[PDB]
């Protein structure tokens, strides 16, 4: 399954809205709603989103 589809991503984005940054077990709640994606897979997707925004804002990939 590995790369994310358009529709997986849209679901992911909806899930970030329903389960806010304060939600405990945030990735597990998000992954439960995103069919066929594990908590750690969902956590990695978020990290890549954060890094992408950081690159856009600064012009350097974060480490």
UniProtKB/Swiss-Prot annotation:
Induction (free text): Up-regulated by both CYC and DICH.
Cellular component, GO, one term: nucleus
Localization, UniProt: Nucleus
Domain spans labelled SANT: 1-54
Main localization of the protein described in the UniProt heading: nucleus
Gene null: resulting phenotype: Radially symmetric flowers. Loss of functional stamens in dorsal positions. Organs reduction with five organs per whorl rather than six.
GO biological process terms, semicolon-separated: determination of dorsal/ventral asymmetry; flower development
Tissues expressing the protein: Specifically expressed in the dorsal region of developing flowers.
Domain of life the protein comes from: Eukaryota
Keywords attached to this entry: Developmental protein, Nucleus, Transcription, Transcription regulation
Keyword Transmembrane helix on entry: no
One term of GO molecular function: DNA-binding transcription factor activity
Functional summary from the UniProt entry: Involved in the dorsovental asymmetry of flowers. Promotes dorsal identity.
Protein name according to UniProt: Transcription factor RADIALIS
Species: Antirrhinum majus (Garden snapdragon)
Full-sequence range covered: 8 to 70 of 93
